[PDB]
C-alpha cells in the first residue's frame, strides 16, 4: 500500500521570530481587572521558530519531535493542511494518535496504525466532475485495537488546489500531561505573505481528549494536488499549492498576565526575558518608575 | 499581606476549612485545623507588632 515519493529537493528550512505569540488561558477561573502570575509551559517571547514552505519541488512533511508541547501556526487560504499524526514510532507496534479533517470522515482514531514512509492525503481532480476526495486514504494498514475511536461529526471543508495571498491565521497549542491531550486554538484574519504577524492573541481551550498514550514525535498531513498535467503516479505526480506553517516548542516559564474588565487576557510579561521584565514581575506592575530595585540573588 | 496570608496551607492538606471539614472525620480534621490556626495566629501577631 505504501509508496515512496521522489523528486523533492530538500533545503535547510528558514527561521523566523515569534514576537509575543502563543499565550493561552491557563485555567477556567474567571478573572477581571487583575494582574495574575502563573507558572506553566509557554512559548518564550522573541523565540526562534523554524519555517516550512509547502510550495524546485520544495515539499516538506518531516517527522518533527514533540518536546513538552508544540505551538503550531499556519497561514493559508485553501485549507492545504488537514491534520496531524502523533505517536512514538509510527510502526504499528504502539498506539498512535490521529486527527484528520475531511468531509467524508474526521477520523480522531487512537488505534495502532502501520504508517507509510510518507503519510499523506491526496486530493485529486476527478474527470467526471470537480469532485475532490482522498486518493490514498490507506495511510495505515490495520487497527489492531481502537481505544478512543471518538469520531466527531465529519467536518465539512471545501477541497480545491489553489494558490494566492494568505488570508487567515490558525494557531494551535498541543500538550500531553497526565494522560490528557489538550488543544488550544484561535483564528484571526491577516493578509500578509511574510513571517508571523506581530500581535497579542490569547488561545482559548478547544478540547481535553483523554487519550493517555506516549507521544515523542509528530508529523503533519498535507493535501497533495494530483492534476491532469502530472502523470498521477505516487512518486512525483502532483501539483504544488501554496502553504506555510511554523513550529515552536514550549518550556517552563513564569508569566504575568493582565485581565481587562471583560475578562480577556490582553497583555503578558515574560519574567526571564530581561532584567526589566524581572523588575516588572517583582513589582507586579507593567510600569516602573525611577529608582533601584532588588530582584533576585 | 494579611489578606494574602489566608491562602497558605501551613503544611495542611488545604487552605480552606470547609474542604477539610467536608472530607475528614473530626479526630483527623483537628490535626490540620491546628496547623491552620497556628499559621494564622502568627500572621496576626506580626501585623499587630
Amino acid at each position: 500500500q505504501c509508496v515512496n515519493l521522489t523528486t523533492r529537493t530538500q533545503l535547510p528550512p528558514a527561521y523566523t521570530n515569534s514576537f509575543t505569540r502563543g499565550v493561552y488561558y491557563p485555567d477556567k477561573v474567571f478573572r477581571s481587572s487583575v494582574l495574575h502570575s502563573t507558572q506553566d509551559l509557554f512559548l518564550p517571547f522573541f523565540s526562534n521558530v523554524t519555517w516550512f514552505h509547502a510550495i524546485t519541488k520544495r515539499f516538506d512533511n518531516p517527522v518533527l519531535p514533540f518536546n513538552d508541547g508544540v505551538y503550531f501556526a499556519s497561514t493559508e487560504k485553501s485549507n492545504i493542511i488537514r491534520g496531524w499524526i502523533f505517536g512514538t514510532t509510527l510502526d504499528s507496534k504502539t498506539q498512535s494518535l490521529l486527527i484528520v479533517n475531511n468531509a467524508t470522515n474526521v477520523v480522531i482514531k487512537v488505534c495502532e496504525f502501520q504508517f507509510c514512509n510518507d503519510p499523506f492525503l491526496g486530493v485529486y481532480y476527478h474527470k467526471n466532475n470537480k469532485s475532490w476526495m482522498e486518493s490514498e486514504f490507506r495511510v495505515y494498514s490495520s487497527a489492531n485495537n481502537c481505544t478512543f475511536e471518538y469520531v466527531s461529526q465529519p467536518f465539512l471543508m471545501d477541497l480545491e488546489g489553489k494558490q494566492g495571498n494568505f488570508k487567515n491565521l490558525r494557531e494551535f497549542v498541543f500538550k500531553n500531561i497526565d494522560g490528557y491531550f489538550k488543544i488550544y486554538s484561535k483564528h484571526t484574519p491577516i493578509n500578509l505573505v511574510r513571517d508571523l504577524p506581530q500581535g497579542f492573541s490569547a488561545l482559548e481551550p478547544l478540547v481535553d481528549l483523554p487519550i493517555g498514550i506516549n507521544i515523542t514525535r509528530f508529523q503533519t498531513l498535507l493535501a497533495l494536488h494530483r492534476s491532469y498535467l502530472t502523470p498521477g503516479d505516487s512518486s512525483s505526480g502532483w501539483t504544488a499549492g501554496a502553504a506555510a506553517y511554523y513550529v515552536g516548542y514550549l518550556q517552563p516559564r513564569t508569566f504575568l498576565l493582565k485581565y481587562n474588565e471583560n475578562g480577556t487576557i490582553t497583555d503578558a510579561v515574560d519574567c526571564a526575558l530581561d532584567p526589566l521584565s524581572e523588575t516588572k514581575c517583582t513589582l507586579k506592575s507593567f510600569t516602573v518608575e525611577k529608582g533601584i530595585y532588588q530582584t533576585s540573588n | 499581606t494579611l489578606v494574602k496570608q489566608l491562602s497558605s496551607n501551613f503544611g495542611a492538606i488545604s487552605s480552606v476549612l470547609n474542604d477539610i471539614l467536608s472530607r475528614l472525620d473530626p479526630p483527623e480534621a483537628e490535626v490540620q485545623i491546628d496547623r491552620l490556626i497556628t499559621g494564622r495566629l502568627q500572621s496576626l501577631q506580626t501585623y499587630v507588632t
Partner: protein, 297 residues
C-alpha cells in the same frame, strides 16, 4: 453581629448513569502485580456505601478522605487498579511504606488520596496443584516512580561480569513466580487488591454521589452546595461575562465570588451575609442604667 442562614440548598448535575463498580471488583481475571491494569470511571453516579458493606473485605483503608463522607463529594475521572498480591505484602500498599513490592512494583505517592480495598481469594484462586500464573519483579536497577508500570523483562546484571544475555553466572531472570497453594498458611494465601484513586475537581466534575437537588433560592442568606463547593452567602444574578469553558470566578484575594449552576447553566453572584461589631454607649452606672447601642457599619 451576624446574620444567620435561613435554609440550605444543594445543586448537583442531573446524571442518571450508574458507575460500573460491579464488573471491576469481581471479574474472571485479575492481572499480576508487576503489570497492573487501570480502569477509568467517569460520568456516572457512584454509591460507595454499598461497597462499604457489600462483603467482609479484609481491609478497607482510606487516606485523605473518610468513607462515611465519600457519598457527599464530587470527583473527576475515578481510577481503579486491581492486582493479586501475597497476604504479607498488603502492608506495603499503604502510602509511604517501603518494601519489596513498593520499591520494584506498584507504588503510591506520599500525598495519596483514595481508598485501598483487599479481600481473601483463597476459596477460589488457590489451586491444589499450584498457581504459577502470577509473577512479580524481583530485580530492578533503580526505584520505581509513583504510579509507574514496568513491562520490560531483561536479565539483571550483578557485579562487574556482563550478562550479554547468556543468563548464567551473576545473571537472573527478573520475574519470579508465586506458590499459592491451599496447604500454605494464611500469610501465603493470595489476596485481591483494588485501589481507588480520586483527584480533586477543578474542571467540571460528573462523578458525584446520589444526592437529590433542591430548588434555587435567591436574595436570602442561605447555605449552598454547588458540586461540593460549600459556603454561606446571598445568591444574586450577575452580569459577569463568563466564557463557555469557565465555571466559576475569583477576586484579587482569590475567593470564589461567582459560580455557574450545574443544571440551568446560569451565573450567580456570591455575597457574604451582613456582619459587624457592636458598641454600647453608657453614661456611667452611677448616673443611670440606660444605654444606647451602635451597630458598626
Amino acid at each position: 453581629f451576624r446574620v444567620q442562614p435561613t435554609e440550605s440548598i444543594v445543586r448537583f448535575p442531573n446524571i442518571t448513569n450508574l458507575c460500573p463498580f460491579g464488573e471491576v471488583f469481581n471479574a474472571t481475571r485479575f492481572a499480576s502485580v508487576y503489570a497492573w491494569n487501570r480502569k477509568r470511571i467517569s460520568n456516572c453516579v457512584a454509591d460507595y456505601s454499598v461497597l462499604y458493606n457489600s462483603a467482609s473485605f479484609s481491609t478497607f483503608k482510606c487516606y485523605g478522605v473518610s468513607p462515611t463522607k465519600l457519598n457527599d463529594l464530587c470527583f473527576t475521572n475515578v481510577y481503579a487498579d486491581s492486582f493479586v498480591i501475597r497476604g504479607d505484602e498488603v502492608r506495603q500498599i499503604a502510602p509511604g511504606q517501603t518494601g519489596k513490592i513498593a520499591d520494584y512494583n506498584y507504588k503510591l505517592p506520599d500525598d495519596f488520596t483514595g481508598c485501598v480495598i483487599a479481600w481473601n481469594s483463597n476459596n477460589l484462586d488457590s489451586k491444589v496443584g499450584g498457581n504459577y500464573n502470577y509473577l512479580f519483579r524481583l530485580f530492578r536497577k533503580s526505584n520505581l516512580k509513583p504510579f509507574e508500570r514496568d513491562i520490560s523483562t531483561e536479565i539483571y546484571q550483578a557485579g562487574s561480569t556482563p550478562c550479554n544475555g547468556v543468563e548464567g553466572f551473576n545473571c537472573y531472570f527478573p520475574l519470579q513466580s508465586y506458590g499459592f497453594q491451599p496447604t500454605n498458611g494464611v500469610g501465603y494465601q493470595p489476596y485481591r487488591v483494588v485501589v481507588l484513586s480520586f483527584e480533586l475537581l477543578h474542571a467540571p466534575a460528573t462523578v458525584c454521589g446520589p444526592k437529590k437537588s433542591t430548588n434555587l433560592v435567591k436574595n436570602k442568606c442561605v447555605n449552598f452546595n454547588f458540586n461540593g463547593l460549600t459556603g454561606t452567602g446571598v445568591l444574586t444574578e450577575s452580569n459577569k461575562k463568563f466564557l463557555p469553558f469557565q465555571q466559576f470566578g475569583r477576586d484579587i484575594a482569590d475567593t470564589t465570588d461567582a459560580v455557574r449552576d450545574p443544571q440551568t447553566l446560569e451565573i450567580l453572584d456570591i455575597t457574604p451575609c451582613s456582619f459587624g461589631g457592636v458598641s454600647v454607649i453608657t453614661p456611667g452606672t452611677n448616673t443611670s442604667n440606660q444605654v444606647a447601642v451602635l451597630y458598626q457599619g
